[PDB]
Design a protein around this ligand. Structure first.
Ligand SMILES: */C=C\C1=C(C)C(=O)N/C1=C\C1=NC(=C\c2[nH]c(/C=C3\NC(=O)C(C=C)=C3C)c(C)c2CCC(=O)O)/C(CCC(=O)O)=C1C
Ligand SMILES: */C=C\C1=C(C)C(=O)N/C1=C\C1=NC(=C\c2[nH]c(/C=C3\NC(=O)C(C=C)=C3C)c(C)c2CCC(=O)O)/C(CCC(=O)O)=C1C
Lengths: 516, 538
């Protein structure tokens, strides 16, 4: 593929954390094909000995009494001599696997989750703004998890990320408003996190615990761990955290109708374990954030569409009065521009092209109109930097930074478009984007960024991104160009009664030659 | 416009249900001025003698210990020698009001609450549709509350509503599929329910306990009960509930966006009392359901509008393929009809109107267009019925029952409209709506309906409602219509090349006016050829 950062498989690591013990059951005969190598403390027997025997005589006597509801719903609490343990059950890779982990110790915690979900679902939330919703979710995440530093991470088109908001406690650095390279998150990571919503790495210094046996005898590969929540992450990502200085990690993915909208991040300077109940409560909390944001964007787009219609109102009303379309646009050009938020407009109906406001030279516009012919689009065209697609205008980007074009007609040569100037924008990177990874002699792998200090770069010949409202405003301008062009048709309609008058002029000079 | 069902107030009854006990406080030292008459058991002292004295000695010592957290949070579970109670505290009418209610005897209900929450939100919820979401909500509400019958009530424009889905229990009657008159819920009821979502009527035949004293001295009014959740409903609604035979009621309000879009009702045939945590858990269910309904509706409507644009596309392309607009519409008359789903399409660009599909004759549509010109509509005018508004075409309601129209020009007489035939449907009424109420002798109050048997009636000369996608499709029809108006600009240049041979004919008019003036030059030339003759004669 592109790099070792992607070709590396994540399913087949076969690494398990030291917190719990993983056990496996094979079909009806209850075969323990693969077991953890740290089961001596819990199971009281050597790990290698337990291979190949039945589940009837190996497990502690307690949890068969709890086996029924474990097979029913996959969760319970069981008492053990070492202490209270949390039991989860899931079946994957054509085999049944069982695991045990420590559980909570504060019974008062459970009602807190209900209280906080009530607070979040309570009305008047989101009216304050979209941005504050992320912070008022992150602060509650801090309270539930009790971690140190929490960011909110949002994905861009090219899979690079930004920090929309964060909530921390005093005494640590913050990455608010910082961007990160797209390659920092591998593609296989996105594919895996599409299915598994959450994950937990409570220690960074811990060595991975080997899985015995190394490979399943008949599968030919080690046991899959995607379904389990105790998987050990790749060692490469560990050095990234260690250089970052984080000891414990906890991330929850946000899903929007099949799209990885963003990730919640949590960090800690010291190792700290966390229970399954807290994880699931946090997951339930994060699930409603997508719905809240959906409601917010529906309301915002409704307001924007209403505002665009309101602005369309008087522009259409003024058109149709005394004058011609070229006269009307020239006289009423002030109200034209704000529909698309541009600085110049151009229309081509068959005559010489007409320009209003800031625009490229007269000779260039028809060259562009010809240039727009072959690119396949049906209604609209978009660009934030036309210089890539069309080099000649990149020489003078003062008005050619961004263009929005629309088909007034079918594939024939009739078009209208708008122009935008360039806006300076400066962004701050964490490390050098040019060197996302630090190479090592021997090319065994690619080490992560050496440092994490803020670094700034400036982009030029770029226009602010086209919104979604102006895309509909283009169709609105088409619906307003009708009406004014229909008044053109009405003035041509009394030119049509003047065509009846022209036939009257025909037979008028007819009876005039009759008279002379 | 207000019958007797809109005069009496609800928040000034001053009645409290049998199970509860009400207490109110005034002033920084929090003296006692309002107390229920059934407080003999819990307080152990005559109610009258305790009002106006120091609050600390009146309240039991156990309750006074946990005052601090109850003051802030407002909810608390406490233990009494009689049993376990839940204390509710709230502020209303500039007064401190606390409440005492029996507590729940079930320890682990909250785990079930979280289980139902995670069931509803789901990794994938409501993929099937809205109706399935309502059905899922109904039976979950039943399970969480343990009631017999539940309702889902949705309001129309005129505040008259029908039931969509229900969770139905065996061995008892249901109400799914009928409508209820808007008179059932008065304006005052909607105004009150706009704020308080939780309404519980523990008993139907219980008599409200009076609050001594009847009137607050400084205010001159009965103590407000809107803030509290133990209000006693008006006796007329108690009789209305008794007529059904239902004993206990539970009503949740689905306030999605500043409006009472939906009401969730629960019924039971036997006395029953719920716990406060039950109501609090059920409260978030309504918000979840409303939010998911809104999200699903928006997503589905956006997806359908995408298909509308996708169908708009090839219509525009094909219409721009041929250069005979009237003929193209005639041959492609099928396609234009399903853009808004109408059956009769009429085009009027100022010339002779074009008629395709089922439509009335030209004179009726011309008269309708003439009437539409002074009729004020900003961009569009859509209605399902026209006989109510326009008399002359009411006779021809077969095809002119409903129409959707848009204004092509900003002014004048350029209108494009469609035609829709009448659609017949049957609405089932629970009880005859023609007799909404029965008047008692003396006209003191209007008692509710007597019998609730199903009743039927038929609506006529009506068309299905123009749902918003149709209006969006008409606007998109104008938007892609500008495409065929650029094709009509090619046709405009065809009319203008007729006018261009007419402009060459205008230059012809110039030099033929020169010709028809210089033929008079030959006229005065003949006059000159005669002028020496007439001079010789003279
Ligand atoms: C190709 C390997 C590799 C390099 C080099 C690189 O840049 N990424 C990487 C390793 C992996 N990272 C994995 C996990 C992972 N990394 C991030 C990155 C961030 N952490 C932040 O808080 C932050 C900022 C903002 C970013 C962009 C994240 C979010 C993840 C997911 C899990 C958490 O770290 O929480 C990873 C996956 C391994 C596995 O799932 O076992 C790889 C391969
Ligand atoms: C004059 C008002 C009035 C007449 C007459 C009438 O038709 N109803 C009525 C009395 C009131 N009822 C009030 C509350 C109330 N009524 C209903 C009605 C229904 N219950 C159903 O199951 C159902 C169906 C649908 C209908 C039509 C409902 C749902 C409520 C809210 C509380 C519950 O009953 O659950 C009322 C409000 C004042 C008060 O609280 O006393 C009036 C005036």
């Amino acid at each position: 593929e592109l790099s070792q950062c992607d070709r590396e498989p994540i399913h087949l690591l076969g690494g398990i954390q030291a917190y719990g013990v993983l056990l496996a059951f094979r079909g009806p005969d209850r075969r323990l094909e693969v077991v953890s190598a740290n089961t001596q403390a819990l199971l009281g027997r050597p790990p290698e000995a337990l291979l190949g025997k039945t589940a009837a005589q190996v497990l502690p006597a307690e949890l068969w009494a709890q086996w029924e509801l474990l097979s029913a719903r996959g969760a319970l609490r069981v008492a053990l001599p070492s202490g209270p343990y949390r039991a989860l059950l899931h079946e994957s890779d054509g085999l049944t696997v069982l695991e045990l982990e420590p559980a909570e110790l504060q019974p008062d915690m459970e009602e807190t989750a209900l209280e906080l979900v009530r607070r979040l679902v309570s009305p008047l939330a989101g009216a304050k703004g979209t941005r504050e919703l992320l912070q008022t979710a992150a602060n509650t995440v801090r309270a539930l998890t009790g971690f140190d530093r929490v960011m909110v991470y949002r994905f861009d088109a090219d899979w690079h990320g930004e920090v929309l908001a964060e909530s921390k406690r005093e005494g640590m650095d913050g990455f608010l408003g910082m961007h990160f390279p797209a390659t920092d998150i591998p593609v296989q990571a996105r594919a895996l996190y599409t299915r598994n919503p959450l994950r937990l790495i409570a220690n960074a210094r811990a060595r991975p615990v080997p899985l015995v046996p190394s490979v399943v005898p008949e599968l030919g590969r080690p046991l899959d761990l995607s379904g389990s929540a105790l998987r050990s992450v790749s060692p490469i990502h560990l050095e990234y955290l260690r250089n970052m200085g984080v000891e414990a990690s906890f991330s929850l993915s946000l899903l929007k109708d099949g799209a990885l909208w963003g990730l919640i991040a949590c960090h800690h300077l010291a190792p700290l374990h966390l229970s399954y109940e807290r994880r699931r409560a946090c997951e339930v909390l994060t699930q409603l954030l997508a719905l809240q944001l959906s409601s917010e964007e529906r309301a915002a787009e409704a307001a924007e569409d209403s505002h665009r219609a309101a602005l369309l109102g008087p522009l259409a009303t003024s058109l149709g009065a005394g004058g011609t379309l070229e006269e009307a646009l020239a006289k009423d050009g002030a109200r034209v521009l704000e529909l698309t938020g541009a600085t110049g407009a151009a229309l081509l109906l068959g005559g010489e092209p007409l320009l209003v406001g800031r625009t490229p030279s007269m000779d260039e516009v028809e060259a562009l109109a010809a240039w727009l012919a072959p690119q396949p689009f049906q209604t609209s065209f978009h660009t934030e930097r036309l210089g890539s697609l069309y080099p000649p205008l990149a020489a003078r980007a003062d008005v050619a930074a961004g263009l929005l074009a629309v088909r007034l007609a079918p594939a024939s040569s009739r078009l209208a478009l708008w122009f935008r100037p360039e806006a300076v924008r400066t962004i701050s990177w964490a490390g050098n984007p040019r060197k996302p990874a630090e190479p090592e002699p021997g090319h065994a792998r690619l080490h992560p960024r050496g440092s994490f200090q803020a670094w700034e770069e400036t982009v030029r010949e770029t226009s602010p991104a086209w919104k979604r409202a102006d895309l509909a405003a283009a169709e609105g301008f088409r619906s307003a160009l009708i009406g004014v062009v229909l008044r053109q048709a009405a003035e041509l309609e009394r030119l049509s009664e003047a065509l009846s008058r022209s036939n009257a002029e025909l037979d008028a000079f007819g009876h005039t030659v009759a008279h002379d």
